[PDB]
Every structure is written in structure tokens, then in C-alpha cells.
Amino acid sequence: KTKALLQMVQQFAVDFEKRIEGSGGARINRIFHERFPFELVKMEFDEKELRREISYAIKPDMAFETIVKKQVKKIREPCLKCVDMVISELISTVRQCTKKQYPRLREEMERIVTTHIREREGRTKEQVMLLIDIELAYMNTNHEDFIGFERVGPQLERQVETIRNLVDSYMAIVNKTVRDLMPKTIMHLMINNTKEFIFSELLANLYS
Amino acid sequence: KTKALLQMVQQFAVDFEKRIEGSGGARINRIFHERFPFELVKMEFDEKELRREISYAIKPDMAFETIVKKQVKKIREPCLKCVDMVISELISTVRQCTKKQYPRLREEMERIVTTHIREREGRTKEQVMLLIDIELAYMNTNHEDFIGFERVGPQLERQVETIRNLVDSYMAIVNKTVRDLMPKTIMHLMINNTKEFIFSELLANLYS
Amino acid sequence: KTKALLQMVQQFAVDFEKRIEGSGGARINRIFHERFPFELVKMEFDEKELRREISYAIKPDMAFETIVKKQVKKIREPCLKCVDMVISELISTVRQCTKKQYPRLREEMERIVTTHIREREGRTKEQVMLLIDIELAYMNTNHEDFIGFERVGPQLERQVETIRNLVDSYMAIVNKTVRDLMPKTIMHLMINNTKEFIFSELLANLYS
Amino acid sequence: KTKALLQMVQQFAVDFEKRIEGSGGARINRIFHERFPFELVKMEFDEKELRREISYAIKPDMAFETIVKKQVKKIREPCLKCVDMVISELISTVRQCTKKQYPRLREEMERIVTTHIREREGRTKEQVMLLIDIELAYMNTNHEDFIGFERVGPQLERQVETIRNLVDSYMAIVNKTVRDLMPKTIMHLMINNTKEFIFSELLANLYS
Amino acid sequence: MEDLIPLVNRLQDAFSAIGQNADLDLPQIAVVGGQSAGKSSVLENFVGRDFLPRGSGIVTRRPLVLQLVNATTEYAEFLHCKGKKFTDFEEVRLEIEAETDRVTGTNKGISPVPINLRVYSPHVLNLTLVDLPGMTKVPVGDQPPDIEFQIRDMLMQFVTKENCLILAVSPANSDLANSDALKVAKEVDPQGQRTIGVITKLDLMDEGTDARDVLENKLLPLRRGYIGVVNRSQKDIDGKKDITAALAAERKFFLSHPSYRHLADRMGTPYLQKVLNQQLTNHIRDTLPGLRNKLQSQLLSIEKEVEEYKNFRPDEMLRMYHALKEALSIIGNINTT
Amino acid sequence: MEDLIPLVNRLQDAFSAIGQNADLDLPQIAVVGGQSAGKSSVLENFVGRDFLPRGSGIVTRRPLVLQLVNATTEYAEFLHCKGKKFTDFEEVRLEIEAETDRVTGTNKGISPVPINLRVYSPHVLNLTLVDLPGMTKVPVGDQPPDIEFQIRDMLMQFVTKENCLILAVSPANSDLANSDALKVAKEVDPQGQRTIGVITKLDLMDEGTDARDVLENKLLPLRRGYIGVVNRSQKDIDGKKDITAALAAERKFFLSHPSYRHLADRMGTPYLQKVLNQQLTNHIRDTLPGLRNKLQSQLLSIEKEVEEYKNFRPDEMLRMYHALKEALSIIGNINTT
Amino acid sequence: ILVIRKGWLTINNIGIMKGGSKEYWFVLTAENLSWYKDDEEKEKKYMLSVDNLKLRDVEKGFMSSKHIFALFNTEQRNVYKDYRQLELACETQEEVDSWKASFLRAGVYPERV
Amino acid sequence: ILVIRKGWLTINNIGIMKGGSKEYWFVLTAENLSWYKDDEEKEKKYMLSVDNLKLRDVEKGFMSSKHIFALFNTEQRNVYKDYRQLELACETQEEVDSWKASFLRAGVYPERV
């Protein structure tokens, strides 16, 4: 009993700082974050579809409300993809190290670690869902972009001139958000949480 | 009764398109709109007070989320106040009108009049309220103020990188919003609603 | 009983500022006023028929009297049309909102509002009639146009030279009048009067 | 009696074509016509007094309608006065003529003479009166003076737009009318009517 | 198992009343296996009823597709037996088996023709039991030479049902890697939480082979491991040998074989019984969230009809209203265990 | 010699058990020589057994390739004598010699055809003895004229074996420089530590020649020098003359020849015996280091199998393990003498 | 006051001393016939009274291709300057005819042929 | 604000006194048509109001190889300086045409042909 806990499951531990936080693990990981954005651009759109809504709305706060709501729902497609890509390297790493042949042990040893991944793949994915639904409850105006008055990531002309600038931004701009926000999520959750678990939840329960 | 309603109580009616919609409502109103901004400045704040909240979170999206809460709630004070200033002189004009002598007749005459407009002075305020409550919820990043990475307008790399630039400017800009939006608002609502009053409700009960 | 008065017949009220005074109601309404003039031009005439009368008359005040009288009667045709066009949007709006299904109520509720339109379509039309008859009693000279000495909207030559300019104006000129005067009428009466009524004559009688 | 009427009382007759129609009527008349205008200026007014009436109405056609009333009535004074000036010297010529000795004859002779012309001095004035009374009634907009939107010659958009330009000029121009019209008038009427007098009525009663 | 029974039945009735998809789809249990697995003995052991044709070698000699249907008339109907209705489940067994034995002899004669019978009873749960003929590689008795192919396709039409508890029985005197019993069975119910590999008739194996690594649970570790069984021979079955007897014959083999002796305490049918139940509970519970959401929406609907009574001048609702309330409550309680 | 015997046998058995190259390859002893060397007499003198055909002049008149093989059945097999098995080594000699003598006469008749015999006995060491016909230059008796070439090639197929102790016997009545006996022999075993040049039949030399310088050990000094011998004539051999007798005839010549008298005390077969043994020991010992290293590695291997038992959830080894231990110990002790 | 017509006509009998026959811009009204150097009217060649103006068919005129007609005052010798008649010439007969009818209207009457 | 087009055009009627016909760099927007000596815009030849600007097909122009067109203010005499119309000339007909359509967009409308 002593042998496995002491050597088999502790050198593997140092294995894990190694693999996750380092191509090797170092920039296998980084890779996924800066190739993720490409996904976003493709299966999303902005500009003139949103633009049409403006005219009816005005006849500024009252006008804004209906406009943005219906587009935001469609941002689901890309975001999910990032999550899965993360899973590949991490889920398979933990399990690689656990058998080390004998008669008594193993079984238990697996049971503690594997089930973690199930619970934590749900975290990240769920955070994506929430974020998307959020849009229809809010449509804030404090945010970030420029002022009024590839997807970016008779004298009627004078009348709409001013109003126009307000609405248009929010669709285009939201794309900027998702591309950075998804990766950030992963870092906390997918990556770190699991990294921790396997190192230690295994050992303590064993020895006792 | 058909003759009496048709003539006697419809000539009184026409009086009121005149004053309010083309002092009365016409130019009482203008005055209040351009002294309104002063209201705004007083019971509102920005800058480094807001920064205090940040320290609790940091010491990325989820942590940032809480910040504004109690501040956005406090922007009610000025906007609401404008409403009352308009109401005072204009609402009281219609209500004066029911005494125009017989003591048998007067008692019935009074009771019918006041109520409808009374409740619909509330309407106007409520639309302002909607915009305000909205504020508290999310704060993603695209809207006006500047990006991370008259009102003015270790692993640091993920966390603090964005946080720093956003917070301070952020509050200031929403103040910008209100000051212009209120005056517009009034034009549609206050003005017309009350106009209706005398024109019709006076007649109304008598038909039965 | 409470439900209908409170909600069904009060949100409809705000409905009415909306619909009348705003294509939507805003420029559905304006439309009718500036397309009305076309009606006038067609079914009216001036110039040389009137011109013939002058010569007998002189052999200036005495001459003028007989001349203009007989033409003015014929201006009836266009004027009426405007009235009806106004009716269409307004008469149908009020009734759209009144049923909201139940057993007790409704009946009464209709009875108060509908009959108003009958009485007020008579106002406007009657004002048109009066205005037309008026001409044969007056033929004033103070008015507006230029001085003496598509429908606009031997040495005999020296003798009629001066007189001529006086009479000729009045027919041509009257057309200018009607095109603007009819719309003005409507604004006060058709439009506003009815707008008022429905908002309020309904409610008060109900609650009591 | 046939012989007496035919000769004795017809040579007296012929005298009068002479003086009046080709001092007597001929050139008494001319003098009075070109000093007549002075009369006009005195007992008449225009400009800003008239504006007072406007304030009652406004603070569009119906309101404008009342204005002129009492002013147009006051334009009688000058026009009428001219009449009397002509009458004085000319009317009294015929009436002198009945004394031309026998005391038995004179008494019958006088009574027959005066009356007919007497009443028909009234005629002339009355035709002037007609034009004057007319004034009060309507005031639509085309005639001479300028449009909205020697005598000189909120929802503002519907109401005051037209009103402003009309009122002030308006009174002035009617004064223009009278000053020229009176002199013409006289030529037809005064002159001829009285001429008749002596030529025939002298004979008249005697035939029986 | 203590949460599962009561909660499931209660939910199922409420859904039935609403005319919805009741669901809570209880497993169909079927035995498939190579020739000489014992399969009907295994199936009847778990189910608890005697109604399956039994024999040695090839056991199921006609398909019995039995459907238990809760219904008020209480009878059963054979298509091919015009004018028979059994109410007694024992009687079903007696007629099927006895009539075959008298007419075919006791030399393994089989028939592919399924017996369509539906047993109506108010004392049962809505279940489907399917006894299936064994897939084979070599004929015995008067079986045709191409028996192998006919049986294999036939059984697949019934076994595709996703919630099919297969007790994959495979004769040790045939190669386990080339076993039809394992090939079919593992496809339909892979997980191994409720499949436990049962190898019979180890006494008939060729000298020089054994299943030692598999049966010892060390080559391929399973949570519950393996349990072998030694099923009743032809002679015993003929005399209506009772349920207990099969168990006894199992012991005798194990004692003399050196390679299986030490694993004797993790053997027997009874032990196999225990495992199956525990897994079942988990499956039901997971489907719960979906049902709940649908129920909520429907209820509100009819409120509007009441709503419209009250304002403008001139029992399906009730029944449904009540039913919905019930269903929602049950769902939550099962979720919290 | 006292370290060599025991240590060698002990090592050889341990290696046999492991199924490795036992080695410790004991010398094959073969006599080669010109015509009239005596060669079989010399070979049997050292070996200690009577089994070689003997004669004067040409001696080996058929090849006897004998292989001693330790084996349990105890017999021997002639290819050309279908259905004879000797167990008695004396009997082998008796049959070969007697049967030839009766049929060919006593006039030197020879035969190149080897006699394939393998003597199985448990009382022997794994050795190969090879008696070979003498290479010649002139025929005698009824030998063919081209005898010279046939014998020479034949003997070379057996004598190439690197550890072949050649007692290079050369007749003095032929020129030593032109001697076939020395040419072959010196090629295969050059060193001279275990080759001692034996010159026979000095009594038949031509008048006017002698081997004085060579035999005196002064021309070409050797550590053990030279030993001459005078072998048995034809007449003696015929009557089964015993082993001792050859030695006696040696003396007679030496006494009358002036040039060899003084070297008499460094003569005889017995003296030749002593030298051979001492050299042999050295050869074995040097090969020891290589064997040792291989043995160590193999042992460890199976430890890992034991290792893997203890940790992860579901007699060849023994035999070898013991054998290896033995071999390593023996190697060291021999090295330290 | 009213313009009856504006159209070019060639004054065919302009001296050597003034360029020769040049085209000038005619403007006729009911009271006068005025001609300028062009239609901007900054110039003023003259203004001829229509009073007592009469019109004649001028029998070919010079020995040229011009068709001539003339205006002449019935009550005096010269019509303007030292001319007797105002000679108007066109390169085609149709140009000459249309202008002749326009003079009719203005009080230039026919006869004296 | 928005640039409609930038492209060279030849001012064909520049006086003797200023080099003669030279090519100048045109910049048209929705509010003005400005032209510089070059694209660096350090210069400023002018800024002409687009207000009341209208466009005509200029019938060949001078007796040259240039194809001309012009901008002219409907409410006044000169368009800029002392010109009446702004003459733009190209060596080819295709150059003239593409610029004419770009003026259309800017509120220079057709007619008055």
C-alpha cells in the first residue's frame, strides 16, 4: 500500500504543475486563447440589420430598448467552442498517471478524480449561457466604445444624424467582449480548478 | 341633455389646446428645462469614491460586476425633481375650473373632476425610473467611456489590466445621459396628458 | 368591475395621445392637410367668366356688387372632402379599445363615446356651409392680394384699364383662402375635440 | 290752361340745364371735391389702437372676425359730410323761384314746390351708407393689404402666423377707397337729380 | 432502491391523467447468449416468475414476447391459439412447455416462430419481458445447419430498446472472443454497471483452456466483477424442477477446479440480483428536470378564460388544473432524494 | 591442475541449467603426423584408453571420429554397422582392429572412410577425440600412389578446432623441413607450450643425417624442449601388446647413438604427460570475466513482475532465479585461484 | 408695357461708316418699337414712336437676296434719323412675314402701297 | 464631411495672366467642392458653395478637343470670381462623364439645358 501513494501518485503530482502550466504544455495552452477569436468573427454579424430598427423607435431611451434585444441571442454559436478545446488536453492528462498493475487498489483511486471533470465542465459552460441571456435584461449605456453625436472586433439625413450613432455601436462592440471574456473564464475554471483537484483530493482520502 | 352637453360644455374645452400646446404650460416649461442641469450636479458623484468598491473584488468580469450598485440608484434625485417643477403650475390650472355658483349644483360638480390626471402625473416619472433601475446588473465593456488594457466625457495581465481604466471615468458619463433625455421626455408626456383633462372629463359623468 | 376601469380603459387613454398626435399617427395626420389643396384646384375656376361682368356694372362700388356674388356658391365642391378624410382615422381609433369579453358592462361603455362622433362631424361640416354662404352678404374690399391701378392659389383699352384690376382679383384669390382655412378648422374641431372626449367622458360616468 | 301751361311755364324750365349740368352746381361742386380729402383724415384712425382687439381673441378665422367692428362704422363721418357741402348752395336755388307777386296767387303757389327734391337729397347719402355697413361681417384674406405668414397703402404656426401681418395695415386701406369713390358718386347722383326739379314739378300740380 | 419504487409509481399515474408522456420507462430484461448459456434460467431467476421454456444447451425453443399491460378485463390472448385465455401465469408455463415436449421429444428441437401473448393483469407494473433463443455456431439435435444466422437477426429487433438489461451469458466451451453472446450484448448495454458477465458450463471446456484472467476480475476490472453459474441439465428440467435447484449444481464444479476455487465467495445468482437494483435508480432521476418545466406552463393557460368574463357588454379546464399541481411536487422530492 | 578440475565441472553444470552457452570448452586431442610416426600409440598413451587402431608405419587405417556424450541410455551407434551397440570401450577396440586385420592382412592396407561412432556414457566428461590417418609422401603395401593428397585435406576438417592439442609426431627417416606432420600441426597450435616435437624411428634414418641441433634443444629453445619416442613395430601390435610395452623399445636406440645419449633423462612419454596439464588451466581462467557479467543482468529482470502486483484496481521466474546465483559465485573463486 | 415679340432682324441699310448691315435685337410693344445691341438692354440704339406708323410691302428692295418691308410715319418725311423708312431684312421669306403681322397689332396699319 | 471623390480636372478657362489651362486637384463632398494645387492641401484655390448648384451639358465649348461641362448657381450670375460657369475639361470623354455623376450626388441637379 505504501508504495503507490509515496511514489506513483506524488511524482505524478509534480507532473501536473508541469503539464498544465508548462509544443509542450506551456504554449499548447496559450495557443488556444489566441486562435479562439477567429471562431467568434465568422459565425456572428452586426451593422445594418440592427440599423433599420432605429427609425420607428424614436417616434432616445424609449427607442433604444426594443432595438438591441433580438440580436444578442445569436452570439451563442462561437462561445461554446472554446470550452471544448480546453477539455481535450486536461481531461486526458489526469487519467494518464493513475494505474502505474497489482490486485487491491486502483478502482477507488480512479473514482475520486474522474468525476471532478464532469462537475467542472458544467461550470464553465453554464457561465457562458448566463452571460448570453443577460443581454436581454440590461442593454446598458455607461460602457465602453466612442460617443454619439471580418466583423469588427428630403432632408432625412440631418434628422437621424444624431440618434444613429448610439444604437449602432452596441452590436459591433459586443463581439470585442466575447473574444476576450471566454478565455478569461477558462483560466479560472477549466484550467485551474482541475489542475488543483487531481494533485490532492486523491491522496488524502487514500491514506486515511 | 344632448343639447346641453354638446354646446355649453364644449366651448370651455377649446381654451386649453391654446395655452399648453399652442404662465401656463407653454413657457413655464421652457424655463425649467435649462435650469434643470443644476439639479443634476448637486445630488450626484463620480471618481475616486467609486474606486473603493474595486478593492474588495480585486484584493475579472464577476468581480467588476458589483461596483456601481448604490450610485446608479442615487441618480434618481435630480431627474424626478424636474417633473415636479413642471407639474406645480400646470396641473393646478385645470382643477380651478369647477366653481364657474349655485350651492345645490356645486357639490355634485366638484367630486367628478380631479382624479384622472392626478394618477397620470405618476406615469411620466415611472418611465424615468425604468432607465435608472436597469443600471445595476452587468457592465460588460463597449458603450461610451474608454477601454482598459457638464460631466466629464503578478497575473496583472488578466485581472487588473482592464479594471483600472474603466472604473473612474465610468460614473461620469451616465450623468451626461440624463441631463439631455429628461427635457426630451417631457415634451411627449407631461404636456399632452394634462391638456386632455378639461376638454373631456368635465362632460363625462353627466352622460351616465 | 375594478379591473376594466383601472387598466383596460386607462392604458388605452395614453393610446390616444399617442395615436392622434403621433406612417404612424404623427404624419398620417399631417399628410391629409398638405394633399388637401390638390382637391381645391381641380373642381374650381376663376378669370374671364367673372371678367365679362365688369363693363355693364360701371355704367366702382355700385359696379362691384353684382359681379362677384354668383361665383362663390360653386366653391362648395372641394371643401367638404377634407372633413371626411379626417373622419376615417379618428372615428375608428376610439372604438378599437373598448371591449378589452365578460357579462355585465360593455354596452354602456360604448354608448357614451360613439355618439360624440355624430355630434362633432356635424360641427366641422356646418362651419364649411356657413363660410360659403357668407360671401353673398359681404364682398369686402379691405382684404389681402395686390392693389388696382392649375387655378391660381376704339380706345376702349384705356377706359376699362383702371376698373379692371379691382374685380378680377377676388375670384382668383378666394381659392388661396379655402385651401388653408379648411385644414385649420379640422385641427380645432375634428381632431382635438374628439381626442379629448374619449380619454375622459367615459371614465367618470362609470365609476360613479 | 293748355296754352298757359305749355308756354308760360316751360321757358322758365330751360334755364336749369344750363347752370347745373351745362356759384351754381357746376363749379361750386369742383371746389368741394378736392378739399373733401381733408375731411377724411380728421375723424378716422388706423394702426395700433386696432391691435388691442386682437389680444382678446388670440389670448383663427373666428377670432380674427370680430376686430374691425366699431372702426368701419366711424368712416361715415367724412363721406356724409361731403354731401351736405354740395347740397347747401345748389338745393336752395330751385326753392327761391316761386315768388316770381299777387297775394291771392302766391299762397297756393308756394305749397306745391319744395318737397320732392328734399327727400331725394337723402338718396345719395344712403348709397354711401350701404358700402360702410358691409364692412363689419367677415374679413377672409385676399383683397388689397399684405398677406400673413393719403392713407398708407407654441402653436404659433396656425394661430398668430397669419394674424400679425394683416391687422395693422388693414384699416388704412379702406380710407383709400372712400376718398376717390365719393367724388365719382356725386357726378351721377347729386347733380342730375336736382336739375329735374324746376323743369317739371312747377307745372305739375296745376294740371290736376 | 428505497427512494425509487414509491416515487416512480406516483409520478407515472399523474402523467397518465394529463394525457402526456408518462415516461419513467422501466427496463425490459432479456437474456441473450451463445448455445448452452442457460439463458431462460437466468432470466426467470431475476424476474421471479416461472413462465419461460427451459432446457439444456439451447433453451428458448420458441420466442415468448410477453407484454404485461395493466387492464381491467384480466385475460391473455394467443394469436395462434384461437380461443385460449389464461389468467394464471403458472398455467402459461405449463401449456407452452408440456405441449412442446410431448411433440418434439427431448432432443433440442427448436422453432423461430414467436408466440404473441399479452397478459392483462391489474397486479403488475408496466414491463416488457423478452425471452430470446440462443445465437449459435454449431447445430444440435434436429436443428438446421444454418441456425446461426436466423436467430441472430431475430433477437436484435427486440434488444435495440435502449434500456435493455442484458445478462450476457456465454458458454465456456466456445471461445469468448468469438462469442455471439458478448458481441450483441455489449453493443446494447456497454456500461458494465448492470452487465455482469456470466460464463456457464466450465466443466465442458476443452482440456488446455480456461477463463482465469477474466473471471478473477484482474485482466479487466469491473466494479462488481464476475459471477459464473452452472445451469440445470436436461434431465432435471423435464420433471418441473423448481427454481432453487439450479443454484445447487453451481457449487460442485467450483470446488475441484484449482483456478476458480478462491473466487467462490463472489459467485451465485443471488449476488447478481443485488447489483442490478442499485444502478436502476440513477437512470430515472436524471430525466426529471425536463418533465417539470413542461407541467408549469400548461396550468396558467386557462386562467385567461376566467379573466375575460368580467368586462364588456353582451370542465376540461378544471380537470387538468388539478392534475398538473400533483406532478410538479413529486418531481422535486425525488431530486432531493 | 588442482584448481582446474573441480572448478570447471561445477561451472559447466550451472550454465547448462540456465540454457546458456556453458562453454569451458575442453581440448580435443588429435595426433597428426608423417607416415611412420606411431601416432595412435601417442594419442592413446595420453588419453588413457585402448580404442585406437594401431600399426607400424601407417597406423590409423580408418578414421575413428569418436564423440563422448553424457547421456542416460548408455550405448553407441555405428552408421555403417546397422544394429550394433557397444557399451564397453574395450569391445570397440577389439571389433575395429580384429575385423580389419583378418580381411586386409598385415601389409598396411588403409581406407579413408571415417567410422562414425558416438559413445554414450554417464561416466565421462564432454570431450571429442579424433584419431587421424598419417599424411604421407610415399605409399607402402597396397596403398594407392596418390595417397599423399587424400589424407591431408581430410584431417584438416577436424583439426581446425582452435583448442586442438596436437602431438606433432614426425618420422626421422623423412626430412623435417619438408615434413607434412609439422606443417599442419604448427599452424593449428603454434605456441609450443603444449606442443612438444616428437621424432620417432631414428634407427631408420639414412646414414649421414641426424636431428642433433633440434633434439638437443639448442638451435631453437623451447620451454619443455624435445622428447623422442620409439614406437611399437607391426609384430608386437598384432598380439594385442599392452600399453606399457611401447616405452621399453624407446630405450634401446638411445644408448648406442653418440649424438642423443646425453639427452636421455628428458625423454619418454611419461614426461610429455606432465607438461600438457599445466598449460591447460591458464586457458580456462581468462574466459571467466565475460561469463560473469551476462549472469548478473538476467536475474534482476523478473523482480519487476513482483513489483507490479501491489497497486492498481481490477515458475520459469523461480527456476532461473536460483540457477543464476550459483554461477556467479563459482566464477569469482576460480579467478582468485 | 406688354412685349409683343422679341426677335432678331437685320438692319439692311446701315451705312458704310457703322460696320454695314448688322443684326440687331428688336423689342416691340403696343406703344414703341425699340432696338438694342442685345437682350441685356444696356445700350439703346433708339426708340421710334408707333404713332402714325403704317406698313408697306417693299418690292424686293436693293438687288440682293433680302426680302424687305418698312415702317413709315404717315405725317412726316423721315421715320428715324435720316431714313424715310426703316428697312428690315431677313435671309428667308418666312422670317419677314411673321414680324410683319406683329407690327399690325401694335397700331402699324396696312395700305399706302 | 464624406469625400465623394478625389480626381484631377483641367480648368480650361483660366486666363493668360495665370499660366493658362492647368490641371488642379478636385475634392467634392456633400456640402462643398474645393480644389487645391495638390493633395497635401496647403494651398486653397477656393471653396464654392454647392447650394443652388445645377449642372448642364456644355455643347463642345471652345473650338478645341476638350469636352466641357459646367456648374452654375441658379440664383446668381457668376459661380465663382468673375465666371458665370466653372468649365471643367478632360482630354477624353470618359473622364468628363464619371465626374458629372459624382456632382449629381452632392446636390447639383440636372436640367436648365
Chains B+H touching (3+ CB pairs under 8 Å): no
Q: Which amino acid is it at A201?
A: E
3-state helix, strand, coil in chain E (%, to 5): 45, 10, 45
Is E36 known to sit in a ligand binding site? yes
Question: What is d(CA E131, CA E151) in angstroms, rounded to the nearest whole number?
Answer: 12
Torsion angle, CA of F215/F219/F222/F223, rounded to 10 degrees?
100
CA E177 to chain centre: 24
Strand order across the beta sheet in which G32-36 lies: G46-49, G32-36, G22-28, G5-11, G86-90, G67-73, G53-57
- The yes-or-no reply on C/F contact (3 CB pairs or more, < 8 Å) is no
Experimentally determined by: cryo-EM
- Identify which of E318, E218, E306 has the alpha carbon closest to the alpha carbon of residue E259: E218
Burial of E174 from C-beta contacts in 10 A (0-12 / 13-18 / 19+): buried
- Residues from chain A that touch B144, judged by Cβ atoms under 8 A, are 141-147
Q: How far apart are CA F96 and CA E106, in angstroms?
A: 77
User: Residue F234 annotated as binding?
Assistant: yes
Cell numbers that stand for D20 in this block? 347745373
Question: How far, in Å, are B31, E235, F50, F131, F267 from residue F247 at the CA level?
Answer: 158, 92, 15, 20, 10
Looking at beta carbons, which residues of chain E come within 8 Å of C1?
310
Half-sphere exposure of F153 (CA within 13 A, CB side): 5
Do residues E6 and E36 share a domain? no
Give the residue among E222, C20, H38, H18 at the shortest CA–CA distance from B21: C20
Which chain C residues contact residue E311 at CB under 8 A?
3-4, 8, 99-102, 104-106
Which residue is associated with the grid cell 362700388? C61
Distance CA C4, CA C97 (A): 11
- Which chains are within 8 Å of D by 3+ CB pairs? B, C
Residue from E325, E326, E329 nearest E302 by CA: E325
Q: Does A114 touch chain E (CB under 8 A)?
A: no
Give the span between the Cα atoms of D155 and D162, in whole angstroms: 12
Of C181, C183, C175, C146, nearest to C45 (Cα)?
C175
Q: Is residue G111 part of a domain?
A: no
Residue C193 at interface with chain B, using a CB cutoff of 8 Å: yes
Q: Containing domain of residue H34, as a range? A: 5-105
Residue D88's domain is classified under what CATH number?
A: 1.20.120.1240
How far, rounded to the nearest angstrom, does the alpha carbon of residue A149 sit from its chain's CA centroid? 35
The beta-strand segments (E) located in chain H are 5-11, 22-28, 32-36, 46-49, 53-57, 67-73, 86-90
CB A179 within 8 A of CB A36: yes
Asked whether the beta carbons of E67 and E88 are under 8 A apart, the reply is no
Name the DSSP letter for residue A155: -
Per-residue CA distances from B43 to B180, F208, G24 (Å): 17, 150, 84
Residues listed for chain G: 113
CA distances (Å), origin F110, targets E173, F63, F66, F106, F231: 69, 10, 19, 11, 19
Q: What is the 3-state secondary structure (H, E, C) of D32-70?
A: HHCCHHHHHHHCCCCHHHCHHHHHHHHCCHHHHHCCCHH
Omega of the bond prior to B143 within 30 degrees of 0, cis?
A: yes
In degrees and rounded to multiples of 5, residue F255 shows phi and psi of -65, -35
Number of Cβ pairs < 8 A linking chain C and chain E: 44
Asked whether C87 and C37 are in contact (CB, 8 A), the reply is no
- Grid cell, residue H108, equals 447639383
- Rounded CA separation F164/G31 (Å): 166
Query: Any idea what the CATH number is for the domain that residue H17 is in?
Result: 2.30.29.30
Q: Tell me if E310 and C1 make a contact (CB, 8 A cut-off).
A: yes
**What 3-state DSSP class applies to F164?**
strand
Q: How far apart are CA D37 and CA F11, in angstroms?
A: 169
Amino acid at B178: V
Question: Per the annotation, does E174 bind a ligand?
Answer: no
Chains with ≥3 CB–CB distances under 8 Å to G: none
Any chain E CB within 8 A of the CB of F309?
A: no
Quote the number of domains for chain B: 1
How many Å apart are CA A165 and CA A152, to the nearest integer? 16
> Which is nearest to H7 in space by CA: H65, H94, H67, H70?
H94
User: For residue F314, which residues of chain E lie inside 8 Å, CB to CB?
Assistant: 216-222, 225
Asked if A78 contacts A44 with a C-beta cutoff of 8 angstroms, the reply is: yes
- Contact assignment for A4 to F309 by CB distance below 8 Å: no
Size of chain D, expressed as the number of residues it contains: 208
Please indicate if any CB of chain F lies within 8 Å of the CB of E252. no
Same domain, yes or no: E273 and E233: yes
Taking the C-alpha atoms of residue F308 and residue F314, their distance in angstroms, rounded to an integer, is 13
C85 φ/ψ angles, rounded to the nearest 5 degrees: -60, -40
The residue ranges of DSSP E strands in chain G, in sequence order, are 5-11, 22-28, 32-36, 46-49, 53-57, 67-73, 86-90
Is B8 touching C (CB cutoff 8 A)?
A: no
Residue H61, in any domain of the structure = yes
d(Cα B121, Cα B167) in Å, to the nearest integer?
36
Judge whether E61 is annotated as a binding position.
no
Angle at B159 between CA B153 and CA B162, to 5 degrees: 20
3-class DSSP assignment, residue D2:
helix
| B8 three-class SS | helix
Q: What is the chain A residue with the closest CA to F307?
A: A102
User: For residue D155, which residues of chain B lie inside 8 Å, CB to CB?
Assistant: 17-18, 21-22
Resolution in A: 12.5
Taking Cα atoms as reference points, which of C176, C146, C173, C182 lies closest to residue C50? C173
C17–chain B nearest CA distance, Å: 7
Helix (H, G, I), strand (E, B) or coil at D77: helix
Chains that touch A (3 or more CB pairs under 8 A): B, C, E, F
Determine the number of helices (DSSP H) and then strands (DSSP E) in chain C: 10, 0
Burial class (CB in 10 A: 0-12, 13-18, 19+), B93: middle
Q: Closest Cα of chain B to D182: distance in Å? A: 44
| Residues of A whose CB is below 8 A from F313 | 104-110
Which residue type occupies F273? Answer: Q
Residue F38 in marked binding region: yes
Residues in Cβ contact with A130 at an 8 Å cutoff, skipping those fewer than 6 apart: none
Name every residue whose Cβ is closer than 8 Å to that of residue F278 and which is 6 or more positions away in sequence. F1
Closest CA relative to residue E7, chosen from E334, E249, E238: E334
Closest E-chain CA to C111? E313
Phi, psi of G60 (to 5 degrees): 55, -60
Q: Which residue has the cell 423607435?
A: A57
Question: What's the grid cell of residue H56?
Answer: 448642364
> What are the Cα distances from residue E219, in Å, to B183, D157, F297, G52?
82, 98, 29, 142
Min Cα–Cα distance to chain F from E215, Å:
11
- In chain G, the largest separation of any two C-alpha atoms, in whole Å, equals 38
CA distance C154 to C159: 10
Q: Cβ(B9)–Cβ(B203) under 8 Å?
A: yes
Instruction: Determine if residue F232 is labeled as part of a ligand binding site.
Output: yes
What is the distance between the alpha carbons of residues A129 and E76, in angstroms, rounded to a whole number? Answer: 53
Chains that touch E (3 or more CB pairs under 8 A): A, C, F
Phi, psi of A124 (to 5 degrees): -50, -50
Nearest CB among A60, A131, A142 relative to B143 is that of A142
Q: Could you tell me which of C40, C34, C52 has the C-alpha nearest to residue C77?
A: C40
User: CA B162, B164, B166: angle at the middle one, nearest 5?
Assistant: 75
Same domain (yes/no): F188, F62? yes
Tell whether F313 is within 8 A of chain E (Cβ): yes
SS3 C150: coil
Task: Say whether both F4 and F119 belong to one domain.
Answer: no
Side chain identity at C190, as an amino acid letter?
M
Q: Is F311 on the interface with A (CB under 8 A)?
A: yes
Select from A1, A98, A103 the Cβ nearest to the Cβ of F314: A103
Among candidate residues D160, D132, D157, the one with its CA nearest the CA of residue D63:
D160
Cβ atoms within 10 Å of E245's Cβ, excluding its own:
12
Which stretches within chain E are classed as H helix? 4-18, 39-47, 89-104, 147-159, 180-188, 212-215, 234-238, 245-256, 269-286, 288-300, 303-307, 316-335
Q: Specify whether the CB–CB gap between A200 and A16 falls below 8 A.
A: no
Instruction: Characterize C106-143 residue by residue with b for buried, 16 or more Cβ atoms within 10 angstroms of its Cβ, and e for exposed.
Output: beebbebbeebbebbbebbbebbeebbeebeebbbbbb
User: Is residue G113 in some structural domain?
Assistant: no
Residue A63 CB-density burial (10 A; 0-12 exposed, 13-18 middle, 19+ buried): middle
> Distance between CA A54 and CA A168 in Å, rounded?
9
Residue G21: CB atoms within 10 A of its CB come to 16
CA distance D40 to D182: 11
| Cα–Cα distance, C29 to C90 (Å, whole number) | 10
Nearest CA-CA distance, residue A119 and chain E, Å: 15
Report the neighbours of H using a cutoff of 3 or more CB pairs below 8 angstroms: none
- Shortest distance between the Cα of A207 and any Cα of chain F, in A, equals 14
Q: Which three cell numbers stand for residue B96?
A: 380651478
Question: Which residues of C fall within a CB distance of 8 Å from D142?
Answer: 143-145, 169-170, 173-174, 176-177
Inter-chain residue contact F310 with A3, CB threshold 8 Å: yes
User: Is G35:G8 a contact under the CB 8 Å cutoff?
Assistant: no
Which cell goes with A52? Answer: 433599420
The Cα–Cα gap between A1 and C180 comes to: 105
Is D158 at the interface with chain B, CB within 8 A? yes
Q: What angle do CA H83, H89, H90 make, to 5 degrees?
A: 170
Give the number of other Cβ atoms within 10 Å of residue D152's Cβ.
Answer: 13
Q: Give yes or no for a contact between B3 and B188, defined as CB atoms under 8 angstroms apart.
A: no
Contacts of E242 (CB under 8 A, 6+ apart): none
CA distance A170 to A147: 11
Work out whether the CA dihedral F67, F68, F72, F75 comes out positive or negative.
positive
Partner F contacted by E225 (CB < 8 A): yes
A55: closest chain C residue by CA? C23
Nearest CA in chain B to D158: B22
Q: Which residues of C26-57 are buried (b: 16+ CB within 10 A; e: fewer)?
A: eeebeebbeebbebbeeebebeeebeebbeee
Put simply, whether E306 touches C (Cβ < 8 Å) is no
Chain-chain contact of C200 with B116 (C-beta, under 8 angstroms): yes
CA distance E335 to E3: 10
Is F138 found in the same domain as F97? yes
